[PDB]
Paper text:
Having observed our original structural information from refolded PopA, we set out to interrogate the native folded state, using our existing structure to inform on introducing an internal His-tag in loop 2, referred to hereafter as PopAhis. The protein was successfully solubilized in 1% (w/v) DDM, and was amenable to cryo-EM analysis. A final particle set of 365,835 was subjected to ab initio reconstitution followed by non-uniform refinement in C1 symmetry. The resultant map at 2.85 Å resolution (according to the gold-standard Fourier shell correlation curve with a threshold of 0.143) allowed building of a model with correlation coefficient (CC mask) of 0.87. The cryo-EM structure of PopAhis retains the five-fold arrangement of the X-ray models, demonstrating that differences in native:refolding methodology and DDM:βOG usage have no significant outcome on the PopA structure (chain rmsd to X-ray ranging from 0.7–1.1 Å). The central chamber in PopAhis also has density for alkyl chains, equivalent to 11 DDM molecules, two per monomer with an additional one at the centre. The cryo-EM structure also retains density behind the helix of loop 2, and we were able to validate the x-ray and cryo-EM attribution of this to palmitate (and thus potential FadL-like role) by demonstrating high contact residency time for this ligand during simulations. The density maps from both the x-ray and cryo-EM suggest tight packing of eleven alkyl chains (the central “extra” chain having less defined density in the x-ray map), with chain:chain distances of 4.5 Å commensurate with a crystalline monolayer.
Numbering used by the authors:
A (entry chain E): 1 to 83, 98 to 344
B (entry chain D): 1 to 83, 96 to 344
C (entry chain C): 1 to 83, 95 to 344
D (entry chain B), E (entry chain A): 1 to 83, 97 to 344
């Protein structure tokens, strides 16, 4: 579930449905599951989503997913939106994926398609998205690749013209497992997007690098206390430049026969500076953050959620569970 | 209940008391039970309803229902209401529902009769509203036939200042269902409806014809858990401006979570075919279509309380948003 | 409790403390118990009430009850009250007191219930008085029931420095018969008369109301954890020079011992076919929607039971801001 | 617990920590326990309170209590507050010390109350003080109780207005008899006198009251006891008011489960409800029926007593679950 | 858990993560664990914090903590904000490193603290640096704790106004003696000077404290333990005020069930409660009664410590169940 992955701070060691859309070899290592994320139909948060994964024999896995929305697309559309507020997100997200085991190497591929339009004279919107993700794994080595083919969103209504177009989206990840407890990974991500607000052309170009590590402090059953160090440098051309060292630690515990408790804390240690270009001014604010969540188990049914009141520290009837998901494991 | 079937995407494989009204042969296969839908009297949502079904012998069933309202009648009355001069047009007042079913050899068949009559003769409301109909269906384990015919329906308003009438000029619904496997089925139906209205001397005609073909496959269905999915092609045409070809693809599960809990969830989308054209021009609309529904039923033996998670559309389970659309069922 | 009787559709088969006030032979069939209805003081809904019933020997019962307010008295005061609320001080019953006795004379159970109420406010600003008295006599054979209710007096006065308004009951009869052909089948009939006169600064108001009722109560499903009842009734009403009504309410409901700590009750009713109310001068008619439902739960703790009604009954919502209302507490000895 | 005593209609048959302040011979019957009342600091409601009682040997008991406030002091200060006078002090830092011993066949106890506080800032200028003792003895069939307030004051020198409330007497004699372990009869005489200087306008009240009553148990059980009680109470306020009442109550405290106690009661003034005004002769007789309820969550040697917050509106919902919470630990 | 140490009135007898922060010899006596304190990021209350403690052998221990904020800093910056000046920076990205070791018969330990932040944006222009250490030792009967602060600057230079705070010293020495496992005494001296500059106008604050007190257990039990303590506190703010208090408290922590722990306490300033102004000479004696409650839900190795939100009003309802929640996972 999304809440499960968030409560563990995107630990990069977590095996989940939501973490396999970019690592499709994990669809072979997962179990047969059906998953639904609670939410609404329009452009609301959270959005309704759902899918399934099944095994074709004993060496293949196939499945589909409804309503997934990209982050690189929704973020750019949101950026252009408040700068015209009728530009469109991914309309009918369609994800197909497949994975097989060729000997000792498992490999997988996921495909994403989306299309929607509105031809009313007062609402001139249309949106199209497409991309693929290919990954192969060995158990000791790990390789992933994410490619975006097309991305577009136009609004031509009543003398107002707006567009956002994806000019490329690359995402390469390499992982190495020195042991079944410790692993090291690296990542390079380029993203060039160009938009027209009303004859005004704007172009952004994002470059990211990532080197990390995930280990285990407490080696136990019931739960494992995990910890991770990471170095991240993000360069946005002619806008800003960042360099962070996020350190996180957390645990996932089978508290009861009906409860799973997830918690983590993170903070950028020593390195938290985001220098702003064309000015030279830096920014080093507080960055300590936490996430908490619960998973209620009824045999083959699990309701993952996050504690709604963790941010204020308060948990009561009015703030109990938010970001709910349901999973059925055949 | 209206929440058990809504949480299960209104599938054609579900057998409830709320599905047996248009499939009267299903009252013989339903367990003897009494249902109460919680709500308030009058133009309220949700409305209050309830009924029963009892077996008269070894091959027969009968019962009655209270307060059930028609979707087409309500839709027509609502579309006429939004024309404040005519926000008194009445709904289906009261509402009586009788049904009967039997087993003639290997074919089981059933009938369902609907009636309604309301009146408000005060000189400043002048409202009157009536309705009637019938639904006949027969079914062997393999072949399923359903015909729905609405004889009449009216809603007149006359308060000495304005006048509004809505009339049903025809409503027929025929469905065919085939069962290859006890876990696979196909169906198709035709829906024809004509509504005549008059808003203070402005005669209006509304005509709708619908087609739909489909499949419901229940893969991985056990005695503790039932996974299913279905595909369907639905075409709908309004005489003047509306043609819509859609491909609804849904999936969902009903799981016996515990001895006191049953969890139901579903997700649906319009895959590829999500197009609705307007006839006046050639304006086509392809907007978002992902939706989900969740619900639960608390089992206390012969008593079950079914509801829908109120926070489903916001994704929250708290005590301020816990249950909605509650109904109480008692299995004799 | 009031909640329990409400969620069972004021069915004439439910034996409860609240149904035995007008059927005083039923106090010999109840167990020994003490009940407290939650509420506040004054003209507040729900009002505070409570009382007990104890067995005196083995063939007699007795008890008392605090705070019971009539329906006719409250209604008659309310119509004048809501007539610039110049008459907003008219007092309802002030301090209710009931004394009931029941004895088993041979095979016939018999019982009497007495009602007294009195209160006043002699402040010149608020010159209010209120008095009421009545009795209820009933007997039962097991198959034959006879119940008689009489209102000896009832009056509510108000004399400010400016206004002057009083209401007064000039009679209130309520004869009722009942036959039991089977432990599931029973039929009954009821005749009711009520004259009310009011004064509004010298303008008399008169209200005469006559009622007739015939109905039956039967069982569609018999169990041991919970039976299943239904009823059909014919109700005719004639408010002199105002309105006339004939109705056919039909109800159906259930009480189920869901667990060892739970009792679930629900019901639904509607006036089938015969829904009709006619005005007298205009001659007009009204036949609108009449589908009502009632739900409630009783939490059992052994000798203590908390009876409530689901507050989300009219909205279909069992949330926490809306879980239990109309709470009452009953201690059974 | 205050919620426990209120839910049971303040009857004289209840043995609670809160009923032993005015009957200090009960501190030897109570088990060794510590009580904390949830609340805030200051002129709040409820107020924070806490104390303990411990056994000193085999026939003695002692303890202390924090934050207790007197009903008469609060009422006298409130009467002046609601009639630039909203800064009058209540009892501040109230201290109670008690002791009890068994003198052969008799049990006797003493409690002492002290409360001092001040605020000498020029724009407030308030000072409050209090003192009193309560001596009681009991045998098992006879109860003798005497409460004697020694001092009580609340001044106010705002620099623009002046005020001062003073106690000029307090007397509470109470004799109780036990016609049986079940039945019990009591009597009570109370005298009080409060003198105030409302910016140069001397206001004086003089309260005289007598109570005769009984408490009886008509249903006997080992899970819970059902009780009722009748009482005649006369109250006279010199040159102002006169009231005669007959408050009748009934109630029960039941151990429903191994983790739950349930308390409920109902009361009403029967036949005698008249309050006569001694300035015009006009009387008053309105509605008296009242109810209270509460619960206790027994988690072993830890019990949390509370009152159902929705009793007045008859709603047990999550926004109106519990109120007047108090935690009790038994050593 | 902050809400635990708060429900026990910050008693010296408790062993927790923060009590170990200021007494590093306790990290060797703490069980291996990791704790996360729920909250938000930035100048928010509660703040998000978390850390762990692991054993390096059989006689050593170490760990780290994220997001801890010192109270002296959070009070000086707050009073400067209360005197525009709303952008003054609190402690940013607080880091804590601890080491403990059972050297011989002694058990020492050291805690280090560091924090740094900035905004360098011309219309905020903020900066906040902090550094300090804490050394302690204990052989079982004698405790020696020392707390020293090195840097405490916190600036603000936007276009118009110019604020500034600085710490010119912070020393805290405490000595404790343990006569029995139950009774303990302690003495503590703290001297801290804070010099601010509010837009050229200089402000100087000097504080000196002297605390001496005892902690004993009134009742003795296995699941719970009823404790109490008496303390004398004097505080002389140079040429601003002078106080002398006597805080007395009592409380308990009960293993109510296998899934529940209940904690509560009550406190008051008995007899000595005075605060005298240095210039005017006036004194204030106001109400000082207070209580605290909290719960800990045990799930085996995971414990959810919370503070009863409705304690200050005496309610337990939907909106007032838990607050100040933290999560602890014991390895």
């Amino acid at each position: 579930s999304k809440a499960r992955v968030e409560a563990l701070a995107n630990s990069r060691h977590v095996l989940d449905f939501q973490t396999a859309f970019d690592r499709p070899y994990q669809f072979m290592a997962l179990s047969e599951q059906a998953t639904i994320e609670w939410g609404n139909t329009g452009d609301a948060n959270p959005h309704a989503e759902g899918g399934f994964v099944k095994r074709h024999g004993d060496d293949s896995a196939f499945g589909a997913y409804f309503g997934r929305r990209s982050a690189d697309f929704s973020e750019a559309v949101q950026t252009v939106r408040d700068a015209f507020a009728d530009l469109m997100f991914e309309q009918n997200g369609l994800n197909l994926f497949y994975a097989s085991k060729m000997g000792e190497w498992t490999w997988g591929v996921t495909a994403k398609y989306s299309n929607g339009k509105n031809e009313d004279p007062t609402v001139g919107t249309k949106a199209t998205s497409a991309g693929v993700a290919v990954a192969a794994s060995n158990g000791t080595w790990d390789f992933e690749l994410v490619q975006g083919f097309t991305g577009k969103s136009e609004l031509d209504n009543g003398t107002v013209t707006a567009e956002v177009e994806s000019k490329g989206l690359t995402n390469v990840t390499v992982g190495y497992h020195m042991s079944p407890e410790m692993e090291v990974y690296g990542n390079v991500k380029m993203s060039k997007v160009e938009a027209d607000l009303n004859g005004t052309p704007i172009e952004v170009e994002t470059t990211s690098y990532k080197v990390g590590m995930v280990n285990t402090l407490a080696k136990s059953e019931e739960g494992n206390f995990f910890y991770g160090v990471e170095v991240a440098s993000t360069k946005v051309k002619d806008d800003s430049e960042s360099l962070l060292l996020p350190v996180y630690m957390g645990v996932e515990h089978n508290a009861a026969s009906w409860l799973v408790l997830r918690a983590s804390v993170a903070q950028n240690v020593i390195l938290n500076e985001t220098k702003d270009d064309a000015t030279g001014n830096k920014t080093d604010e507080d960055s300590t953050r936490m996430a908490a969540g619960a998973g209620i188990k009824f045999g083959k049914s699990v309701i993952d959620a996050s504690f709604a009141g963790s941010t204020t520290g308060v948990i009561n009837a009015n703030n109990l569970f938010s970001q709910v998901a349901y999973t059925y494991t055949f």
